Amino acid sequence: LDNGLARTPTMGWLHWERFMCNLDCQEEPDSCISEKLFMEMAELMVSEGWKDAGYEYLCIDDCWMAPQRDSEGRLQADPQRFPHGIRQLANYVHSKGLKLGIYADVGNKTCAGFPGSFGYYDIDAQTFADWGVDLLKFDGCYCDSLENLADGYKHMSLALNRTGRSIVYSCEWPLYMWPFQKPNYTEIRQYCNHWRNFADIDDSWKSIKSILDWTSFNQERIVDVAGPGGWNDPDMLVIGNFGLSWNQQVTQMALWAIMAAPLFMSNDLRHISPQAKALLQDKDVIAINQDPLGKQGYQLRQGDNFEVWERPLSGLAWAVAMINRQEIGGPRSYTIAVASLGKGVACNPACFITQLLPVKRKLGFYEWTSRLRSHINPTGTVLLQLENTMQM
Amino acid sequence: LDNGLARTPTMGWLHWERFMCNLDCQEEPDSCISEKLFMEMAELMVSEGWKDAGYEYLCIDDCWMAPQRDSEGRLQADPQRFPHGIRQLANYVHSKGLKLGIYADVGNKTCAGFPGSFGYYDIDAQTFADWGVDLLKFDGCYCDSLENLADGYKHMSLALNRTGRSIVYSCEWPLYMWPFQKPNYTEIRQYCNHWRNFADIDDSWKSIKSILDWTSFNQERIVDVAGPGGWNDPDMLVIGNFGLSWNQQVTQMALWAIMAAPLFMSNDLRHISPQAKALLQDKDVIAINQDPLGKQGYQLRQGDNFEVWERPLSGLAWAVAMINRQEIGGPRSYTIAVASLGKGVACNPACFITQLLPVKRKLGFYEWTSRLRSHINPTGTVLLQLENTM
Ligand SMILES: *[C@@H]1O[C@H](CO)[C@@H](O[C@@H]2O[C@H](CO)[C@@H](O[C@@H]3O[C@H](CO)[C@@H](O)[C@H](O[C@H]4O[C@H](CO)[C@@H](O)[C@H](O)[C@@H]4O)[C@@H]3O)[C@H](O)[C@H]2NC(C)=O)[C@H](O)[C@H]1NC(C)=O
Ligand SMILES: *[C@@H]1O[C@H](CO)[C@@H](O[C@@H]2O[C@H](CO)[C@@H](O[C@@H]3O[C@H](CO)[C@@H](O)[C@H](O[C@H]4O[C@H](CO)[C@@H](O)[C@H](O)[C@@H]4O)[C@@H]3O)[C@H](O)[C@H]2NC(C)=O)[C@H](O)[C@H]1NC(C)=O
Ligand SMILES: *[C@@H]1O[C@H](CO)[C@@H](O[C@@H]2O[C@H](CO)[C@@H](O[C@@H]3O[C@H](CO)[C@@H](O)[C@H](O)[C@@H]3O)[C@H](O)[C@H]2NC(C)=O)[C@H](O)[C@H]1NC(C)=O
Ligand SMILES: *[C@@H]1O[C@H](CO)[C@@H](O[C@@H]2O[C@H](CO)[C@@H](O)[C@H](O)[C@H]2NC(C)=O)[C@H](O)[C@H]1NC(C)=O
Ligand SMILES: *[C@@H]1O[C@H](CO)[C@@H](O)[C@H](O)[C@H]1NC(C)=O
Ligand SMILES: *[C@@H]1O[C@H](CO)[C@@H](O)[C@H](O)[C@H]1NC(C)=O
Ligand SMILES: *[C@]12N[C@H]1[C@H](CO)[C@H](O)[C@H](O)[C@H]2O
Ligand SMILES: *[C@]12N[C@H]1[C@H](CO)[C@H](O)[C@H](O)[C@H]2O
Q1: Is B333 in Cβ contact with A28 (below 8 Å)?
Q2: CATH superfamily of this structure's domain B294-390
Q3: CATH number at A1-293
Q4: Distance from CA of A187 to the nearest CA of B (A)
Q5: How does it assemble (chain A)?
């Protein structure tokens, strides 16, 4: 989408995975979807270093709205949970230096069962712009047919444009298409700044594995269509929650950087370990995700329960990820000729290799003819940056 | 098995899950199945507080053997990786106040393809006894018949007894039988100090859940047979490795306590987080696992992606575990009548409840009328101790 937005993958926080559709403010006030949750999360995005690291969009997912539209046919904030309305939350969020995302559905109802945007693309798009919304995520539940799904996604895209406000547009068009027919990505790219391809993530190694396996399986179809203004969306970061080991957390962060994924944390910024915070705020790994060249990486090799991924970076640099998919035993040694990495370009005639994950370690100069030797923890990833050089 | 051993579930360290069958001492001398690995673990079991916490058996799994028996038809330690031999390793482990475990197979080969004990049960038993071995784990690969399986486990049990040496006998009889016919646990216990029920554990939450699900499904058959001298073995603790979140590690520690499981760590004691070390050394949770009554706990309830397990303890105490099996979202609220716990007896007329995991908190006095409310992390467990007011 050529709206001048998302020249790098969008970074921020989205409530869905950690907070879901919790409407019980009486019995579960610390986890219910309320203005207070977003206000508190906004404050901590400033004070705990998240905005400084690049996490800029504070995004509301499903279950923000009243059960019915107002007299004038517009969506309304839930009066109990959002008594001060979207406009005032937008002012609060803007006052902190952050931008506000909101959610809607192409179909007749949102996935949670709240009012769909069909019949109202133009008014809803205009409502969001009045409110001060800077991003829209647009789910695809309760939609008849390819024709509607396609038409709806295309309509809301144009509708948001006609508001002449800068609104990042986040689509689930490809994901709700697979059931009927293979998606067309050059079409989707025209209309959307990013697009969900695969089933919603949850707090599990299994879900991370299933997102990577779908991505590598499908990579010829999706890798080249990604670039500034249009990104593949492999769903939220779930680092800082409950289900992932340290190594599985490193694997998500490493590979979301390799895939030029948008980085939407879904966690509780009020209760996050120092180790999880440091990983999500890792300047060097965020810098790989946010590389201005904006070329998506890919799986180079697989076998013997190992995976090798790489991503081309500006200035003849490459990121390399080595995953150990063996879920038993100890760290396994993997060796590769540096000539095989970065299409033989990265280390011609030499590169300087820095390990970024699981720890940051200068490894030094490798000749084009060198072997790189690593040890990789089970379900973990070693992430390396290769800098092309002639200083050797 | 009435040999006076395993009066509480056996505690120690076993190489298999973490170190596996690594024979490459050339390229990986730090990881390979060697005498040096077992000596390093022994030193750290003393120096880092493992023995003081009750971890006492330092156990060798598969891949310690030379490829072929000796001229006198006995098992040998691999001459390069175990150059001083098992007896000398036993001597060293004993000098540190620890016990040594070793491994053999009931069939023609071990699972990793070294000498089996079929035909050699009596020699093997006497060899192990002579070497000063304090424990035998007896795997079941390369056994052609159920007849041979039963006969072998029984035979080795009787041959160990005849040596005169106190040797903890860890069996895999039920696991290898289960595909073909329902094991007779009453018979198995007569011959075994503990018995493997289920597939080898991995460094994964999937492995944990599948072991808990198998145990709760078969609980009618296995819970009542467990007791001093004979335990269900749900396999090794993998806490301190790579594959488990903190909350999944707490779940393993809590439920292994509830199930009165042997506690065999398979980790690197040279490289373990402070967190992992304090969980595995948790005095109050080990005291539940080690309760002298020796009554295995069971699943009380399952529903709404929650499980409640309980174990009756000494002196009118109960342990209660509450698992959140929902792997999406945040800490989920669970409430239960305390009158539904410990068969109606735990909190009649009242109980003091202490949370032990994920952290120690006194929750206070609960009346027989009361409800316990808890927030449980996804894939996490809340472990409580109930003390009847009397
Ligand atoms: C509604 O849709 C229209 C039609 O797509 C859309 O207009 C397009 O917007 C983009 C982004 O503003 C315009 O592209 C710019 O072109 C100008 C002049 O040629 C450049 O200055 C801009 O350069 C930026 O990016 C460069 C690198 O790519 C940087 O070098 C530079 O520093 C700038 O930051 C940019 O390329 C494009 O011209 C229009 N196209 C048309 C047909 O008008 C409009 O933005 C949409 N509006 C909303 C609010 O959605
Ligand atoms: C070989 O097989 C035989 C047949 O089972 C096996 O004999 C059994 O040995 C145990 C263990 O010694 C006997 O039970 C014990 O008897 C001793 C000696 O009198 C007691 O001290 C033991 O009491 C302990 O537990 C008490 C708790 O109530 C403590 O208060 C006390 O301090 C002790 O620690 C216990 O009663 C068992 O009775 C025999 N059975 C028979 C049939 O003889 C033998 O041990 C096996 N030998 C080997 C080498 O495996
Ligand atoms: C370890 O290996 C040996 C040798 O391969 C196994 O011994 C063999 O076991 C089979 C039983 O499965 C015997 O074959 C039987 O022959 C009778 C005829 O007498 C036939 O009716 C049966 O149906 C069957 O074919 C075979 O005789 C026997 N060989 C020897 C030398 O004893 C042994 O069973 C293996 N042990 C284990 C525990 O797997
Ligand atoms: C995928 O969709 C794109 C965009 O709709 C298609 O590309 C355009 O198709 C129209 C006619 O339908 C032509 O006017 C343009 O020449 C095409 N390319 C553009 C605008 O870049 C494309 O046909 C579709 N791809 C496939 C394989 O069906
Ligand atoms: C919404 O419902 C109406 C009424 O049945 C129906 O005509 C329409 O096809 C539905 N629209 C979508 C986009 O699902
Ligand atoms: C199970 O084994 C015990 C001990 O060998 C025996 O007394 C009992 O009769 C057996 N029961 C069945 C159902 O086979
Ligand atoms: C769409 N199952 C829904 C959720 C909202 O109800 C959430 O936004 C998911 O990410 C999306 O796929
Ligand atoms: C038996 N797969 C084998 C292993 C040894 O080769 C190990 O001991 C397992 O724990 C056991 O079940």
Answers
A1: yes
A2: Golgi alpha-mannosidase II (2.60.40.1180)
A3: 3.20.20.70
A4: 33
A5: Homodimer.
